[PDB]
Symmetry: C3
Subunit: 436 residues, 3 copies
């Protein structure tokens, strides 16, 4: 009886499962690895740290490899609860990775927002906001230390750790541009906050110290790294109409085998506003009260999952004038494409089309070579922004192809593409195999 009686229940169908076993689940043999040690070491920042200033850092050569890099910010609130939306993230307006004077990759604050909306999830995503925002209803004057993790290729997996020991004659530098205006810190809307403190900045790089055997191999041998890059093109959204469905074709200027496309429609006035402001809880300042105004967002709750507030009705991609796939609704690129390939949840206003089975995985799993495509076009059709944004009854009770009239503020269209490339390192110098 019990367990033993099930073992005896053996038949011909078990041959496909347990006939002549190859593995066992009850005796794992663990792999032995190369000895190493990790140390997070502070870097020197060249230039004056302040709003709207450009600063740079040349990575010191303390260890053999480098992996994670974190930027530390200390900021002080200028408003009360819900008046900030990822201020530390917005503050890092853009960050450039350079090896031997050659640009390897460059990221932007809006990419950090889009990456977080697509590829982070669950408690990890909430911990990320803890690192970049006030999430405890803090008031005016609250001061907090923030941690912005970089997400370049060697930051995302130790298997791509950048070998400083093999880059003897090439310096590795990071160029930072700090934002000038950050909501809830030094600016409230367009009015500056008097007495707002300048930010203080610190840069920390995690180093790997290798044993003698592997150290000598890294220094003497040539290396090839399959790395990822970011491509970004900022376009102007066609003005959506309250009487007709506007359309638009954007020529895609991308290169290299590309894993996926990701785009959003954002209002440049408000960081992360990817959807239309409306008079429903969390969609505008003072929503559901006598002070409701759809001109100003509920900053702490700028994001939403309500597809009704998204502006894109349908979209498709064309290759040399032919449909790459049949037109799908905007919700397909927001819900189904992340469901099929990511497995998290993406707020409305952020869209994905994946060429890869696993776009979040480092291992390649399907790409499109945009370097071999003469014409690539993103065809867009917008909803009819005819809903009264001040009426919750109208916003919460409407049809698929209409949206709030405040969608006309979503004037900026940001399209991102994540591609692969090869970083060859030999004779103390690094270089990308393909420029375009």
């Amino acid at each position: 009886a019990g367990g033993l009686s099930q073992l005896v229940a053996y038949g011909a169908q078990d041959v496909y499962l347990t006939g002549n076993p190859q593995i066992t689940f009850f005796k794992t043999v663990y792999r032995r690895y190369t000895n190493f040690a990790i140390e997070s070491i502070q870097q020197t920042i060249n230039g004056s740290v302040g709003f709207g200033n450009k600063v740079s850092t040349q990575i010191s050569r303390n260890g053999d490899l480098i992996t994670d890099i974190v930027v530390e910010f200390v900021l002080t609130k200028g408003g009360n609860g819900g008046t900030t939306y990822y201020p530390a993230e917005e503050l890092l307006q853009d960050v450039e990775l350079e090896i031997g004077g050659q640009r390897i990759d460059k990221h932007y604050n809006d990419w950090f927002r889009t990456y977080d909306a697509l590829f982070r999830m669950n408690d990890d995503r909430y911990n990320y906001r803890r690192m970049t925002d006030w999430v405890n209803n803090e008031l005016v004057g609250a001061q907090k230390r923030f941690y912005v993790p970089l997400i370049f290729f060697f930051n995302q997996t130790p298997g791509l750790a950048l070998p400083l020991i093999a880059l003897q004659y090439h310096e590795v530098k990071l160029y930072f541009t700090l934002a000038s205006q950050v909501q809830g810190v030094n600016y409230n809307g367009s009015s500056a906050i008097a007495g707002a403190a300048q930010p203080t900045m610190s840069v920390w790089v995690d180093y790997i110290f290798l044993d003698t055997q592997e150290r000598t191999r890294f220094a003497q041998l040539p290396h090839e790294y399959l790395i990822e890059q970011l491509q970004f093109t900022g376009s102007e959204t066609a003005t959506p109409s309250a009487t007709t469905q506007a359309s638009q074709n954007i020529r895609l200027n991308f290169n290299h085998p590309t894993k996926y496309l990701a785009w959003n429609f954002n209002n440049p006035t408000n960081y992360g506003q990817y959807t239309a402001l409306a008079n429903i809880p969390g969609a505008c300042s003072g929503a559901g009260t006598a002070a409701a105004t759809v001109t100003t967002p509920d900053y702490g709750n700028t994001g939403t999952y309500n597809e009704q507030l998204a502006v894109l009705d349908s979209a498709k991609i064309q290759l040399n004038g032919q449909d790459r796939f049949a037109t799908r609704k905007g919700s397909y690129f927001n819900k189904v494409q992340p469901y099929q390939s990511i497995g998290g949840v993406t707020p409305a206003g952020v869209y994905l089309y994946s060429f890869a089975l696993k776009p979040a995985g480092r291992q390649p799993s399907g790409t499109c070579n945009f370097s071999r495509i003469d014409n690539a076009t993103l065809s867009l059709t917008y909803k009819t922004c005819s809903i009264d944004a001040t009426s919750p009854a109208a916003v919460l009770g409407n049809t698929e192809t209409v949206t709030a009239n405040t969608a006309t503020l979503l004037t900026a269209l940001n399209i991102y593409a994540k591609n692969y490339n090869v970083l060859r390192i030999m004779s103390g110098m690094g270089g990308l195999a393909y420029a375009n």
Copy 2:
């Protein structure tokens, strides 16, 4: 100092960890794969799309393999906030997969509910409800597009992608039965909603386009696929008593090496009602107010994690009249079995017993061959449904082996079993190795 001083701290105990390294964490070699492309292509639906109608689709032969399949529904609300509970999921009452006239698998809406409660989790599970329900407090008349992803074997992993190119002489068809009554869409309780719109349906299949090398291999070579199937038997729950603990033995008519058993006790009147209605927040219409009534649920919040509202007190399985394991409480099959083998959270009223170490994984990891068992029995003991469901003090303050008196409405008992089988494909035809 720092990192380097830890490397020198080397001893005899490090031999088991780093002595003669086999792997390194800092130089990942990625695998090269076969070139391919994905395209989601719309299918033709034969038959009239409407409530209570049967429609079918014969998969067109555009590509070499097929993977994901999504059913698109457009629906209009008939009620306000919290008056729908997975309407798009319920609408797809059952879906049958057929290859060459032979049934390969068949799923049901209640299986989608049970699968979601057991194997989906976190943001992925919330994104799934976004695809199948209104989650933004929408009002009467709100119209939304829904996406119901199929979960047959080739839908769940690209490694089991169905090769249409190798099924030249066998058609692959899907048979859909649409529900007749869906709460919050065309029916409110048992009263039809006047002017309710018929649903519109669309079926999309993702195709894989293979390169010439692999294309020829798939078309000429014989193939064997280790696939999964669903077995379902619907039984009548024994009437639980308010004065004694009712018991019941259900003979299990299952076959094949089975990964796990999953069952629920549901009230057929309400979709997904797996627990007793009670006068506590979220457990009945107007709970905690003067309009509270335990005859009608809070539809938007039909599920619960409160074990007190579950009807099963204890259960065990018997093999040929002998205990397969000692009796455990119903909470064990709801909490511990998912904890030990799934790692998510399952609402009360859904129970699991796993024969596998990893029942959610496609790779087999332990099964029981129900084809070699003459008698398999699920022995059940029910709680004494003697709690006053209208009293929150009684519901929120009671003992282990009692439940709310409204548990007598949980009359339907659905038992599911997930088994393995072999799909052999050769000479343009597919066929299952084992029928029973």
Copy 3:
């Protein structure tokens, strides 16, 4: 067009991705494994089950291997909503694993709390609280069955399943110490709850039944298992000042290759209180009301993510009087270290420093050999606990290096280290390779 036109877009850059394929994503070959069966079997408990009592269990030899072990508790509430905080977890004050009279590992209730805060996440972590607490606003007299899963080496992965069949001459025993006072069960603060029921205890061990081939191998062959252990040292926190920043150096008495360090500052009066009590929602009894008192916590909401309520300002580790790394703020060890190596979220007051790339993984990925270090020191600097804890305006609006004046109650400092060891099993006896 469509998918097929992308396949033709092939170039020289695709050689690194798809040139001469090694793998395919569309034909997974699953591994065949050794046949087995699982059975959860109840154990005998020696000694009287009660608050403050020590009981033990000698594992019966029903099967070949053992894996998961769960302790079942039945408890009755003595208070209303939010008056319990993981009572089943606290009740299991400490549990010792012993093989042949030799201690293999020993865990504590505070380790369960710290482990849950660091390595559990998402729905799994919420399901764990369902197994160890009331989470449905239950009132006085509610009785619930709880499940405390053990987390020794063979409990966490079946690949380390303890082979009873190979331990013929060594008994495997578990020694439990039950807590004497549990908030919300038999004690309210320091006042006992009259008529509180003694707990009832049950111990269940999951057995693996092996087939003849593998059974004989396990019984005759020598075995080596790479297992993990817990090291714990309890220290007294230096009294933090409201006028200066107190500091403290703790000599670390640890051994073996250690994966990570984890520590907290807790108030022994309240289970899991890792942060200072304050007059903000969820931080003290009756917070935000006329009955607010920072002397008593909101038990149901004892944890927090608000770094302001944490007492540690900065910390670093020293090796033989030299900095192992540069000083970082306490939030770094609470936010960044879990972000970089765990990927969840950790409440404030729990700190991590990892020597491993993946400290939650069983496969070793970097350790420090504390057996080869003569002096290891944790250097601590505390915040100035000068904030008026009774003032929400002061707590929610302050600077980085200050905390609430109630932080002086965080007098206990618990430091944990997770190390590796080798369990050798031969001739029917088990033994650890290294004692220190």
